[PDB]
Amino acid sequence: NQYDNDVTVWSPQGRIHQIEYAMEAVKQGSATVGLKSKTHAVLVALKRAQSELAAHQKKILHVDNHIGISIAGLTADARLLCNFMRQECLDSRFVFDRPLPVSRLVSLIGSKTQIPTQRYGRRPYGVGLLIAGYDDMGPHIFQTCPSANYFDCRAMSIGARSQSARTYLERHMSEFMECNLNELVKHGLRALRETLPAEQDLTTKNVSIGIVGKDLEFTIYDDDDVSPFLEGLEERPQ
Amino acid sequence: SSAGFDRHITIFSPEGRLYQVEYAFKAINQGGLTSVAVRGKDCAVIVTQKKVPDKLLDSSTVTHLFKITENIGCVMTGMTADSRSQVQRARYEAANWKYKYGYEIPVDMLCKRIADISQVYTQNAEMRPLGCCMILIGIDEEQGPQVYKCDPAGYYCGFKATAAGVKQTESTSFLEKKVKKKFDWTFEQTVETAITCLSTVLSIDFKPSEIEVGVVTVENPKFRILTEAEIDAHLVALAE
Amino acid sequence: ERGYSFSLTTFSPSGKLVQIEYALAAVAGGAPSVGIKAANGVVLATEKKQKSILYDERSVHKVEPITKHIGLVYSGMGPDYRVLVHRARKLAQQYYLVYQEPIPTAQLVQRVASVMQEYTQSGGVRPFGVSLLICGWNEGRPYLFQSDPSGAYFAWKATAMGKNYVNGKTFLEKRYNEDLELEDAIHTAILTLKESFEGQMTEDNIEVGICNEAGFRRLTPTEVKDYLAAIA
Amino acid sequence: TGYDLSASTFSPDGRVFQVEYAMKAVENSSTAIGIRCKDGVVFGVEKLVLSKLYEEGSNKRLFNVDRHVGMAVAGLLADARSLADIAREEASNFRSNFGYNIPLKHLADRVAMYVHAYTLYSAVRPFGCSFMLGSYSVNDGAQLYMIDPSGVSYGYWGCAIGKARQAAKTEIEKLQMKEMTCRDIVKEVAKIIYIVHDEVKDKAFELELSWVGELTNGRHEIVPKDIREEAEKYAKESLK
Amino acid sequence: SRRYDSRTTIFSPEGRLYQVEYAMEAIGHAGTCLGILANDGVLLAAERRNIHKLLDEVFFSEKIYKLNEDMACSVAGITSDANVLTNELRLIAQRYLLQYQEPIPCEQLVTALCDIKQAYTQFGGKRPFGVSLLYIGWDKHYGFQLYQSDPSGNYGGWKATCIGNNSAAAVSMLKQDYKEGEMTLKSALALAIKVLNKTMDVSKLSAEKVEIATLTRENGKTVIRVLKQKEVEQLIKKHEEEEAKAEREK
Amino acid sequence: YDRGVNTFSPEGRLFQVEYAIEAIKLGSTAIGIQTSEGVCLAVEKRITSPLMEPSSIEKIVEIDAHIGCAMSGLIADAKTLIDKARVETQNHWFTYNETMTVESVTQAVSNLALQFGEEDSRPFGVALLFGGVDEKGPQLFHMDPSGTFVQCDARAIGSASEGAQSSLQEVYHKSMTLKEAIKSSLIILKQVMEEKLNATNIELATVQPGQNFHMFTKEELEEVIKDI
Amino acid sequence: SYDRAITVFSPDGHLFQVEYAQEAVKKGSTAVGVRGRDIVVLGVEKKSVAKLQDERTVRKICALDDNVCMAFAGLTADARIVINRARVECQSHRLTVEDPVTVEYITRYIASLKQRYTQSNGRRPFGISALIVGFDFDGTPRLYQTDPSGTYHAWKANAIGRGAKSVREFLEKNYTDEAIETDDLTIKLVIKALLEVVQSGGKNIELAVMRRDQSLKILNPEEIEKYVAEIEKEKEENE
Amino acid sequence: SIMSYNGGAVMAMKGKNCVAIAADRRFGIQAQMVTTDFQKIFPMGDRLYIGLAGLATDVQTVAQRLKFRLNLYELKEGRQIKPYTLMSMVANLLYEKRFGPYYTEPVIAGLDPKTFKPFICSLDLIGCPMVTDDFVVSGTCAEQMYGMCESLWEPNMDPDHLFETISQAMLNAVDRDAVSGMGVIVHIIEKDKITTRTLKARMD
């Protein structure tokens, strides 16, 4: 256990435990779900609150005209990588005068997070990214990790009790590719209503949805343009 | 006598020791490798075996004989990374000598610079002291051929019958029993004594495909790596 | 590197610096040497036994000139010794750049001891296990300066450093005196070195440098075998 | 025990446990082999789908460093991404500074020195990567190298990195490697990867095959494996 | 990297300081020095460490360092550790003179050196200067002076100073035999001879074991007298005649 | 030294940030309430000596002409934060001829709430209540040492904040008025403090869209106190 | 620099160095100070000289400008650094805006310096606590104190050093607005507070004042003797 | 010239066993004098002076800088300085401003510290030393003092005729000069003592 101190120390079983600890710290964020169609990439998160009176901590935040990211974990490192993200977008927007393809941006993010996991004197980033974007080959749903082993998927779900949501993604990943936005979004919250305990229901104010489409600029919605999305449901089979 | 953190860093111990460097003098011994140098007359001979159990592994790129400059060769033991890094540093300081001073570097000055860099790594802590040993050979005018050895500690020396690696207490015992009869060394004598001393150490008496022979002579001062055919020629020439 | 920059050498509850005392012990576990200041010259002499019969005595040289008139020997570890030799060389040549005159030995010992003192205090590096014996014939009067790893220095009429240096010192006090010549100093220096060395002592076991007023001189094994072939 | 913490220290018997721990980190990673024919080098990586959540074509471990060079990594993936960026940068420097293609020997030596520099100090950890380097040039032929986590880089004809390090190269060495062009070697690598671990520990894997050589005219890319579909119709004939 | 840090500056588990107290105890096992009350003139006393017979003594100063033209200093502790401070100190005085072309008024000199010492007390985390050292000198604003630096950086202007375990009893003799008004250098030399006669364990006080230097004002000059041996010898004979005078009470 | 500055947990979050959230608790309490009429704000000075002059102790400081503040726990770290936030609002005015709004203020603060770093120093030990009036009316903002900044309707900080938040949730609703909220706040103040409530204990700070200047009440506070 | 923090938080939310290094100030020389309506009075105790030596250099009360006055506790060296720094600072304020320096500005400087000195990378915080007395704005008498954390804190009277609880408890009876507010009685009753020290030798008293328009004046132990005599006279009159 | 911005003339002259250095007293701006007691001859230890001429800024500056380095050396070593060492030091100090040059022509005159050997030398504004045995001159007027010294110098001279020779040379060569005059100071030194005489120069 005395080798279980710092980022630099390898294990005598090879598994550097700081990255495992950062993973488990990412697991204790809010739940979130990101999934794409052939033409529309929708990411759906869930908010929590500190108390009754306070507002909810926001998760789905804007990045650029075709990029919006979800998040889980710490918010300071989140806003730090958000600053870097916006910077890297606007830099190529300045130089090449084109929007960035998503994959090279996520390569830049992984290379950015490579250094603080590699030397001594920095920590890995508690971070929960779900990136949705549009290059010329359409929507992409990427996720990252504090180990920077970023993945491309067709539907991920990270955060608290996200595994049952992944079972839902398994049993409807055939269905996902074909449909339009409405039932896509209600599949998304038909994952999130299983991210919750069954003795309560998903209300308006706690949920947030971000859509980007191949002609649609990335737009965030909260309770007012989500009241149309919350109807069209039945109860859970109690 | 482990006082303070003398098992960990470059500090002085009680009674006068420091363990990090005298742990590095057996950092050569994990190589499983053996090297012999000979200088008796106006030629100078290196010999060192390989150990390749694989058919999938090559044979050309496995050689430890490293042409530093056109007149200076060397051979390495110990672990490979430290050896090759030391090799690039040696080449770099040789080219720097040629640029600054206008003429070819002598093997003496170069080994002294390598030992100085070894001290520089030795001096600060938080720095790993490069567990490889370097033997250099070359011809100098008005002195003939030269043999030098470089320690990890930065203690270089230059001497005739030379051997470092795994088994060289025995090799130096053979060379004390051998370099005492006052015979001359007419270059077949040198090659024959080198191969036979490595043959008395390892007791294998093997093919010409295992040892690499590095030679340099005052007839052609260029460094020269021997070919399979002439190694076989010398081998069957000492086969009686 | 990172530049961690802290020194490992801090004070004891006794007030001592145990790394420096260990470095002095590591010096004392080194090769013997003898240096004697006579009435006209100074004699340096070391004791160099090769580990095998394979080593050559033409490559490594203990006795070392710093200028053409300043000899310098040690008792310790050559890898540190060469470093501070080279430092002293560059330092003396900077002096000769500024003043266009040969640097005096006191000035050498000031500057070298300041550098060594700086290594005793600066960050993380070990001190240098070398005890110098610096000398030279500057302005008629010759000098003899011993230094140490602690950065300090002294001035001896005659001294010794290395194995059984106290025994050599006690022989020096009875045998050596204030006024002799360079030859008699060489004689008693070889006597006190041969008091403590091994039995097989030849023209290659020792290495002797003298300091005339004509300058520093490094003797050859030719004249050593002229002299040390049963000097008494 | 106690010595194994820092990456600058030695052991009481003489090795660095940090580098050893980094070496056996790659042991649990996926199996990645590579073999050269007489006019090209063929890569191959046993890649595994986790359960159902991948896309068959993300995070490809077959990288592509230079116009004629690509990597075949195994171990930690993000560390491999960083290492490949270093190699891309180095080949870019050489192309800029000399105006032609980097030779594979010099490239691998620069990479090996970079790896060694990350093995020296205590400020950084050693890498958890083990990768392949393939080449083809008309004046050079086919060259295949191999880099451990420590930094020892030399040449092969065939190799394997992963669990079945021995278990693949047992029957790699019975392949008639010289007399075959790479178009046979494609289905050879296919049968090698398919033989090791069909269903025992896991449920499903997936094949990628990189492909450099004379048939590509010195280009390096993945095969259109779906063109000529050489695994499966030979895979089902390889279970008997 | 962070399990190799020493304490290096930090306060105790109980409220006190570590390196400062250990620096004081490093001072305590050194040579003995003192200075006297003289209205005209001021003096220093010093004890020879390493009085072995095979030295050269050609430096004319083993503890004294004539630092300005009107100031020297004794010293006690680690030697070249102090030689660094002598170099820097002479440098600071000389750049003062470069800036003004008027000699240094010696208290801001002392504060400059004390700030050098204090800068390694708080941050910098290196081995602190375990050297206390005296000050003699003269000026335009107070005349003859005496000062006592400490590794803390605290400095005291005394009229009769203090070194450690060898000299705590010396300060006891200084208080029990305090003088005032008599600026006579020779009575002060007899006093200092008496003080080192008690405190040093050198039996009957051979002059090879001691060292005295003074600083008198001569007509525009403030010369620094590192006096020779014969007058010390007759001073010792004077003091032992005074011992005979003391045992006239038997 | 017991897993310090730069280490996660086997189960959860960082050590020293959790220790900062613990270190907030010893501070003196404060209560802000957002009303659409304007933001009111209160604090307790915790004065010990009669020598301790009351009006020199600052808790509510003034960031801009329409932005208040409140602090907790430590003092001078909060003073440095106040200084830099003032500088950044003035820079925003300098390059924009307008008012840096309250959220942008708090983002400019929380961008280095966690930039604690000793290599390549310690995290700050103060929780802050921010009140201001943007173009969207009044705002009430609550931040923390960990940078996790949120909007609160009526936040209570520091010591005894559990019962403070509870009994504050008892009386609050959306359509409160100003003076009602003020007296309801000082009720909770004199329920959580230990001394008698008088002219020197607490201080009020009220900002209105029409009363942008003078976010303070001075000795009319005595009249406000005597009405309970 | 040294990448190591001295100021890590506790498990329960404290600092192991700041509130801990206040104990060095607690183990120091005592010094009190009040502000009257026109004359300010302060002074240190515990001269503790060897009764044969000098004390004109061991002076613990100094000035930065002609209008402000100093004091400290703890160890003297950190106080020396802070004093020279603050002299440079107030004279550089004179280089700026041409007012005499307000006391609040210079105390903000001192406390801010000490704070950002505690915040930085591996630096031992100043174990002092100063007392900063001055009357600048129309001669309004003020005194501020510091803290090793760096929290300036305005008072009307003050007690630091050894046994300051006992001194403030003498001040408890000595808080009267009357106190009959002459300059001499204010000075002598501050002298009675400093003579409520744990030893009270009477001659170890070092007191100096300022009349809010003049400069610093050091007293003489014969007027202090008259003050001690009239204090004993009032103690006889109460009987 | 810029050397003729403030006038100035320094003459040194080697006698038999003694050395005489003299300079002019005048200081002022281009056409306007100011004072008659400006210092250009500085004592550098015992039996060894230095003279500086040219721009008075560099005169006082380099005088202070050399005094700085000289006192540093004389405290690092208990002996006093030898004149060749002083010459090398001045050469280094001028050469450090190879492209930022002081506008001065230093003249060094001192005896031997051990014997009664005299020494004279002069430098350039960049540090080119020059040792002679008869005389070295500097300042604005050159050819005047060259002609006079090549007219009046003898090799083996008692201090009296040395004094009279250097006096007549300086007086006539200054009276012919325009921007440099207004009194002359003379330092005539030897092993035994130091004489400083002032001449009744033409104040025109």
Numbering used by the authors:
A (entry chain l): 4 to 241
B (entry chain g), D (entry chain m): 5 to 244
C (entry chain h): 3 to 234
E (entry chain i): 2 to 251
F (entry chain k): 8 to 127, 134 to 241
G (entry chain j): 2 to 240
H (entry chain p): 2 to 205
List passages from the publication reporting this PDB structure:
To improve the resolution of the CP structure in the open-gate conformation, we combined the datasets of SD1, SD2, SD3, and another SD-like open-gate class and performed a high-resolution refinement focusing on the CP component, by applying a local mask that retains the CP structure. This allowed us to improve the open-gate CP structure in the SD-like states to an average resolution of 3.5 Å. In contrast to the improved resolution of the CP in the combined SD map, the resolution of the AAA-ATPase module was limited to 5–6 Å in the combined SD map, and was lower than those achieved in the separately refined SD1, SD2, and SD3 maps. In the CP of the three SD states, we observed asymmetrical gate opening. While the α-ring in contact with the RP in the SD states was open in the center, the other α-ring in the opposite side of CP remained mostly closed at the same level of the density contour. However, although the N-terminal tails of α2, α3, and α4 were rotated over a large angle to roughly align along the heptameric axis to open the CP gate, the helical elements connected to the gate-blocking tails in the α-subunits were nearly identical to those in the closed CP. In the current study, the 3.5-Å map of the CP in the combined SD state was substantially improved and thus allowed near-atomic model fitting of the C-terminal tails of the Rpt subunits. Thus, our structural data suggest that insertion of five Rpt C-tails into the α-pockets stabilizes the open-gate state of the CP.
